[model samples]
Target: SSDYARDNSYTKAAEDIDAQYAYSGNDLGVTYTKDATTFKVWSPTATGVKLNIFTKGSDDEQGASKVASYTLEKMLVDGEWNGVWTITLVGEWKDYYYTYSVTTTDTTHIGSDATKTYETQDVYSTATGVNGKRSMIVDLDETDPEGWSNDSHVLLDKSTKSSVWELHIKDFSYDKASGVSDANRGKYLAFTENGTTLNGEGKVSTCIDYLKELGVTTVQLNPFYDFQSVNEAGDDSQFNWGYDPVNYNVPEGSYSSNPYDGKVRIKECKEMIKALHDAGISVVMDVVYNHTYSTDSCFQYTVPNYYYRMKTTGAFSDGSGCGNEGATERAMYRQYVIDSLKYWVNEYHVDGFRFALMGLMDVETMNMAREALDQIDPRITMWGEGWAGGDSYHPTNTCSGTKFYPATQANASRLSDRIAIFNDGIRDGIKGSAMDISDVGFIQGSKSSAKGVSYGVRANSSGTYKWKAQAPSQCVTYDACHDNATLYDQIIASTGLADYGERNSEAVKMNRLASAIIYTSQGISFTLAGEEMARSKDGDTNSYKSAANLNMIKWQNVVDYADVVSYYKGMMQIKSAFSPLTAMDNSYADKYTFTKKVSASTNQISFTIQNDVEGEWNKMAVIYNNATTAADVTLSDTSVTDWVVIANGETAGLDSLGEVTGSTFTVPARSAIVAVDKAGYESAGIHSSKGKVKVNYVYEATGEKLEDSVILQGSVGSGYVTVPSAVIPDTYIVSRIGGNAEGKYTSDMQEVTYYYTDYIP
Candidate 1:
């Protein structure tokens, strides 16, 4: 893979230089102040550059109503910072719009056609209207939320506990059933509503309140940057995922309360972040800098083919599927990326960044962004989709090339200690092919193929995993995301289930099994907003352009599938309770030890965690059996005479099902189960492990031992139950000894010591 063939793109590799030398200072883009505002842009190769300033009507000026124009003089500061043009104006120029009219020559193009002249917004624009045709000047400080000084991005002390929920800004409240205020609906301010409730079987928390209960550390918002495809002035008929980049630095005006007001977008975006932080959740901005919606826009129009990856024949590289990919390997372009990232972090308090098509970018730029962000706050997390989707036309040495697997090779591996790559190995292992619905994965693959299932638990550095990663951090394991069909919908499509009752019942089990693997894996865990409630995309695989009916989360799902929601909440709670379960620091190749417990019809895996954590079990067993009938598996560990059922097919948020005295436990058909050591029992402790004890039962009135109907009773806490904890606690009988008079159960009783802090290890 390292000896990949060369591509059309090429540039003289330059030295590593600080980006501030080229992109720094108040010299660029109408830097505002009480004394004067300076307008600047870099256009060294241009023969003539004109600065056109326009008047601001009431709010935002439109249609290029030119107030005046001035020819900018060519000047140089340092040897590195040349071709920069600057102009200073007296007094405040707030709300004023400006553009640069540039003329440059292309060395390789046709004679007369080589010379191109056009007008474009300054690359450093902090604010823009609609499609970013013009740049607007505003006091950036004025966009801060109340008590902005105290706003700090939330950081996790442990990497394992970092869970994420992906969302779209407009998807928050665009539907009337979302119950967000009309004014704030489909806008950034919608996230700030605290008491908002959605229409469910009963009143349920919505917006920020819903996220808080979801217990995710990061809320990954889909591209909120000013995108090219969606016209801010357009009506409700327009909807997109916002992957097109119109302005790299400006917040999308369409999501703001007023697209016409240049300042409103920036202010409202910060307001959303501030509100989310208030709820103890960090915000991760999904950034798409790989390509622009069109090649004829801001980037190419101003520079004339210099900012893009160009072929030897002068054709554009189509790595992004978009016409041209950005040239991040170039000095100035790389500087722009670094500068834009720093701006978002400093201006909006964005906690992390998820780069789209990360493979379309260079390694140096990704490392540069990571280094720069680390300086701001080492707590900030960074991750991206490593695979560049389109054709393979990247330069051989460039990191974006397919020669380098984003998850395990080259740049991604070189900096695996910092940046993370999405683990498609785990994703595909759980839910089958991301693009093919007909391919059944692990949960359904027992009937087809499930070779991918074994790869789900591997860390980046492991020799055993399907994709070799340097660290677990490089893996972003998930069952469903915004780009593909929802997991539930995919299940229905692949299984061809017709009845809603059967479909739903199967969905509950499949979802449980998929989620159990995700939360237990050795990498970062992520999920789409409604994944917890088995949200369906109505079998539409690619719903990026679909309307609210398909894309909007059906809030009623929470009411209808309340058990599923509870199951998810319980899983997260379990993850937090057992921190060692998902730790990414240790290598899977290191002290970690695991083995598979097998039966003829089921697959079971067990491991022993050697953490020094107190008041918790270090050993755990996860059993899976999706066969047509119930299957029995025996625990092989003699050290473990008793096992506590924390989770099973009947439940996910593993409510304890007491203890099992027998060696073999029955797993129902199409079910997954988890068992851990009961508290108060340590291996070294002199705790007594119980074997089967017999309890005789008889009819209370007749004293007749009619064993077929006889019901024995026991309680979980203070009350007695006839049914086992594994079954619903409806019956008071602890065990139903049908056709038998005696019943037996396992009991774990031990003496232990504890201090609140001692148990926290």
Candidate 2:
């Protein structure tokens, strides 16, 4: 079996290696104990292996002496080498840094260098030295934060119901105005701080407190793994988005308080996760497994030409556009992907994964990873960009070498239903082309993108212009992300504004209109960080390597653009309170009816969602106006005379703004309005002939009564009464009054309640 001959086809060679050298053991990384430490690595073509131990992580750079060196023994299965090298050192070798020196034969080089020795860090290293130059050995359990064992993901009914906020760790607190201490700024410990304010003494909150106030269920963090850019030992002058991956299993050392100690990074990272979980928010790790930063990596050093996809002429595949796509179609590499995912979940307690450049990987590998995640926790979601960065090469079929396809959006049917692809159809429709800065979108008065926006509102599951998705949950709806331009900058450019100093009244309305469509549409709602505060990159298209001042979140924007932030919060609240907006199936088609326009040139859209007996609302209408002038919209149901306005161009919330007495209402330009029937309770068989109204005060947490019920002498159309603060205890405060908060009452019963933590201190 060891004498397998190499064919001219690289595909055939990959198949032979997958069949012969696939290891099934889980003990590949360092396994540390109090008395001894064991190290294992996989290299099928290695002629010799040695473990070099150092006293410090940066010993190679600082000219420190090495502690010791040992030879490794090869693992055998059925009288053949199993591609596994192992070594065990007794007498307590914890907290030591090590690297492997692999010497491989000339035949495995595959048209490259012949017979060479290379020293590299372990690919499965859970802890690493500065810049990931060497791997560290330590007990993983000791790195857990306080109360980490009891931590769990935030409970959610479905992935589609989640509202995600995409943020970067350094961007969250890099600004001096963020009010974070100098020692904790731009580090993992920044998230653990509470009650942080703007400008140190302002009333507005920042960081975790602001996240809670915004009411987002999940936070999609940018790449925080050990990356190539940004020196860990350097000062805070350098900045990068951390897209360049160097190590998969270890957390980035630059984000930790002390980069010299590997354990500090692990503990601080866990502390950030725990704090977010305590605040009722889930964590989604952004992973870039499609490509590595460079060819001089652990994968290339251990097994030459085996970890990357290559053409028959011995050139690396550039599907990721950064050079050298991972050969996930190979069995051993696929196993590595799955193992790394499981390690993050089991050790770090991550709730979900957002794959970067996911199309470069194989469909089988992604599906297998989903299956493995489901076994651990079904709530762990999987989604990614379903398009490749460039043309990639792979066999049509890995096992049979027939038919060819990458895992792009066009091939979504081949993937599992649990996996979702980002909906660029909606993104481009709402914000125009990301590449073309001067192009206008539907929200900016473009007529060509109306159809795309309509299809996106229905989640592209069932419509005239439907995309290839199994259900509504298979679409991740977003207008802007970290790529290309920010939403504010895109609007300014398309609207022909000079800069941030120019008049932005129309631009503000456009931003709100875009957010309205995102939250009201059927799918998982996603927004980039600082979008609510009109975040801008100063017209810079690609700021991945920009300075800290250009990338940091300006805390002053929250105070200046306070109305925009409030509107975003209100939209999120409405989405959470209403269930029909997040329907997981095509039933929205039956309940929803799009209104017809009198003129084809008019840039306005209107739709009505009929009442479902089991839903929260009875009947609702949403209208959008993108024209330069106000337009009049007629309601489909003319019989409903008293329609309560829940949201309008100026404000949004469950609280009623006013009542519409007629069938037609004028909508302002670049604005949206949402209204509901006031007398919908009659359909539920509640009669007003009883001549008495019931008022119940209850706790939102348990729905239990807080005090005795109050009965008043009133009819169905009678006015409601205000309850004074003396009627309730000082420990509780009213958060909302369900059914009817205004004086005009249409229902016979009402309930007053507060959120779980809404109390007077």
Candidate 3:
């Protein structure tokens, strides 16, 4: 058996968790597990491969981290050729992320084993890998916590002791197993007009220029890869979401204006990257690793099983089930994934890669994937979809799986390479649909998700953070993303709450509460396009088939939630300024380790931002700005100079915020505030957040995790008080006198007078 998970897809398969089957991946549902100090790789034909581990953190521990050495071999598991590569994480691995020094010879190249041709070009067996098993490695941890954000995950001034990082994708990076549209779309600025993006003109002047206005630093997209054929159709054309691979090296034709001219695809894509870069934005390309389109043009000519997962049929495994799962664990296949990743980074100047399915392959392939890309730059962030797809069946569906072998438990150490997951536990806990962290901490009435030894990422999962060296607090948090329905859609259906419920206002309150939890939780938050302005696809969660609703954002909805839009923009500004709010690194991966905290009898719950280990007051702020009830809470922080409050959803600017100072402050009914250590202030500021406010709460804590109830604060939004989701803060008043002085901080100290209208990439 592979050193660790040789027995089953789970590392500690004997130790159990409820097996909730996700019949989504191609009949090969993932099974989660992990063990102490073990690793492995798989290559039907390979000369040799090795494992190399390294330790490092964003700015926290860059270099001081160490490396461990390990080797690959055929482990004895009933003599089943368990190609396990085990290593000790305790000794050799002091505290660092690891990878494999994978090297494969050309005994066989990497490409689909069967003839997966484009539906349009069925006869041609297009070649995928010109270079056989060149070099690469996949990560054991990069899938769950994900790998994206190795360097840029958290930007540090170094001198200031603070950081800035990217959000989203980690929280909900698509599930190819669930079925996507026929897109290799958006390759050359896929959103360009006339093609797919509502604006027929595919011009950066319009596309990226708009991004520039929004201040986004990066935009990572799903495969603009070489899949140019269709799987099935909706009404107009063949809609396969472009997974049918015609060429892996070149950008897909469907994403470009001139499909006949391959040059345009590459050139135009590069141009788009340039535009985004010009605006100081980074670009990342999400790639598929679990499988490839079986109907593509390059499947037949390649070595059998070289480019696909090994399964019952010689055709391909159903791991990714997009017809065939790619043999990523195989050396040659790992090389191709590496090559494709480098192309996006070096050729297109993309910041990183988001692996489509992190669960399908083995340890060896994962190590190779990361190692190959690291050659380009260790700073390039890597992350993959956490879903477990099939490597066994037809492209139509998938099976249950996630957590089998080194694939799952090792996720903690792996998160260091990327950032942590969005933490569904937090969402479900508050949604009243699930428990909070599987424990009864402080959330009033949250149920326990720890039934029947459930593990991995449970609905209310927490207490798992201590497993890794570097843990992040900002595990991306969100209630909705592109894959699911908009907040307007999900909550309305789940709670029967409408945007303008009874008196036509209850749904609006739910919207506020949704945004509230997304930003305020001990993590980072991201809102997809049209969301800030109440954009929705008419309750159709899966709208990939129709370009009409998918292409354009609803401008009319802007009028409906104009206030919320502004509130969200302002909230983002506050969040960006709030360091701890975005920082996800902690000593615990699945454990909640917040030390100092405060709460109000009827209004608020506040956790101060500081380095718990060092007991350092890096900065000061009350996260989770609002509480449903009305309470007078006081936090003890002698380090604070003069504290000022910032409300995430406040229109009340700075005029009133300039007047706060105390060891004790009255947390009004519905308002949330970040009491920062401020030292400066402009003459005229917005004055919406004031001394006395009322936060209405319908959902309170069962033990500490939030329960369900829509909520709102005075003049901030429209919602209930007890709604556990209401803790989110899109706009908050910043303290001018309580935050650390510029001389003491590593990052820029946020000011309260001005607010941002869009995300600054």
Candidate 4:
């Protein structure tokens, strides 16, 4: 099968270049070898690609007179495509930059097959990874990380364990240095348990109570799979994220609890996954498929040319630029990728996967595994980065793509329309702004600016949409993920917003609005940890280096905004009522019925979402107003008309309206409020309306589970639950009188779920 061909997979060929590399190297030649030196880049997609090597101080006549350029021979080793080009200028040094290019006649596309040619970008990448793994035949972006013994089981403390796939938060560098406390990392529950006690008992100790409170379904961690330290294996701070796979076939010693015992690391890792599983959370491991620790990675040392792809003229590809890229197109390559993914899913019971720079691998090779997963993955969430890739060579950029390696469409070898791609575009566009709440009046509450509102509505709906993930098209969808720094750090660096306490007030409003849009929109949505609680950090973007500065959320916020928290609870409840937005699957674009009615006025976009199709369902309407002033919005469908108030003074009311006849009404400034088109539908299935509920809880200290039911009669004038004091025997309240089985309660912490629901009997 064709590896990463133009017609076969969701891949792309771009003129990709790392502008930072050229900028960094102009002062100092590429420095892969040291700090002062930066690695240089020169892509040659032409005849007999060669590097016009330059050494220290080569700009002068004296340097040029010496004919300082070296034509490094292009190695054509059998079964080694990633190794297509290697520097023979052997030395202890690894930092250098040189310009190399070929004739246009030598240019050729990566298995283009006379189909369509999409746009490519100019990118820069490292020689070791990216598109340089000649032996693997394909680049790393979309391959699989090899496992120890090609299996997921190992020994720990004389017991054979199998749940070791939870230590995988893909933290970059800035995560540590920023003002955002590492504690926000603790919010992931899985992240904290793995980092601190990854090697300890598989049970959630006193350290992780968050897991029990919040029913987080699954957690995907960064590279804890195995790799030596990037700086020094033993050096406390020298470890790079485990991308450096020194031994593709074995686990890195440092990540293991017992550095000397592979069995210990393996066993402990399994127990760790089991701990999360026992807590009812699924775990997904971030396997490095795009690159490895070094050139000589893996025990078998079997990276043959069959492992990587090459230019038609036998030149090297540098898409990932991480020193080397993995191969995902060949049989052996396919074997390792499929086996490793299944190993995590079956051996560890992981529910999902978060692939790293996924699209860079060969598409055909990627498909071989998909064919296998058809039988393996039952409820797995498979996705790709959609980075650029191709079996042949492209030019003008590092590996030739400025943006992602292969977009979802270009490289379609393995996945059909069923797979999803992580959309980073949304985050980038809205980085500086979200729907400004202040503009609600200019568009919402007034008939004077309906024309402008129409203009605004037309502006927002323009972009691509992917059905698999329920992802938004206008970009800026990703509020937070394991890759970038925490929100607090972002605030500190960008706006000098130091006090997270004050910043949180604003950030949360933004987050709430963003969330409202996401949920109210057609695509899938996710939350960044601590984002719900205003977690912030200094502006260090890639802070995976150290676990020092990140702080835990101050539980007090829960106390301060108890009502607000409750509101969020209701919002989440509103969301689950509909798996996907009703307006999404319909002809919003083609007929413009929904968009036209709503888009006629951007400031006050109100529409009646009727559940006309009879079923066990909830009928709700979300009035979206992205204006600065309060808006009077009217939903008129002939039979009934009424004003659905959405927001006022930073509050979004889930107000239930009786009906609407025919008229225009008002919506508060910059607010998106959800109203039950039919109030009965909102509580149709939920038992919250029941005045009292039977709460089944367990004492934190005492193993015995207890049952207690309480009455939630109406609006709590001043009602609160009181358990035995935290004095003598160390007693803790396990739940509220009439609430769900919410776990452990302490003064330092507030309720994670709706600890107690106020009901109107």
The most accurate candidate by lDDT is: 2
Which residue window of length 10 is worst by lDDT in model 2? 684-693
**Per-candidate alpha-carbon RMSD to the true structure:** 9.7, 10.7, 17.6, 15.9
Task: Please list the C-alpha lDDT of all candidates, in the order they appear.
Answer: 0.64, 0.77, 0.38, 0.37
Worst 10-residue lDDT window for candidate 1 reads 750-759
38-110: candidate 3 lDDT, tens digit per residue = 4444332333445544333121322533344566664445655432323333322222333344434211232
- Identify the leading candidate in terms of TM-score: 2
lDDT string for model 4 (1-761, tens) is 11233311211121111211112112111233322222222222222333444332123312332124444343343643322233444444332223433211211342223222111111122121111221111122222223312433212110001111222332311233212234333122233242222112222111233333322344456565555554222443343456555433233344343433223334445554565555565565666766655544321122112234444434344556554465454333445567677656664555555567666754444444555665764335555566543333322122223212243434432343234454443333223222221222221233334333222222223333221222222111243454455543443344443443443333344445544544444433444544444444344355455443343234333323333333343344444444334232223333222434432434455544445534423344556565656666655442333333333323332333234433544554545666543344444433232111122334434534433211111122212232321111223442444332223333222322222222333
Candidate 2 lands at a TM-score of 0.86
* C-alpha lDDT (0 to 100) for residue 357 of candidate 2: 79
lDDT at position 97, candidate 1: 77
**What are the runs in model 4 whose C-alpha is more than 4 Å off?**
1-208, 230-241, 246-256, 311-316, 388-414, 429-477, 485-504, 551-569, 582-618, 635-666, 679-761
User: Whole-model lDDT, candidate 4?
Assistant: 0.37
Clashes within 3 Å, all models in order: 13, 3, 189, 162
For model 2, how does the per-residue alpha-carbon lDDT over 1-761 read when each residue is reduced to its tens digit?
01111234676666777677788888998988998888999887787899999877886456556898899999877768887999889878888889999887422444344668999998889998888888999888889898989998764678888999999899999898899999989889999998887867745578888787667899998988999989998878688889899999999999998877788999999999899999999999999999999988999888877788776578877788888888887777888889989988888888989999778877878888999999988778888988888767775465334343456677788887668888888888887998986788888898777766777776766553535666777788899998888888899999875584232667878988998888778788898898988898887788898988888888777655555776777777667666677776666667777776322334877777775655366777788788889999986656566677767777666656688877787898888888777775333332223122345577787887765443332224433333422335668877766644334334444443333225877
Model 1 TM-score relative to the real fold: 0.83
Residue 337 CA displacement from its true place in model 1, Å: 1.2
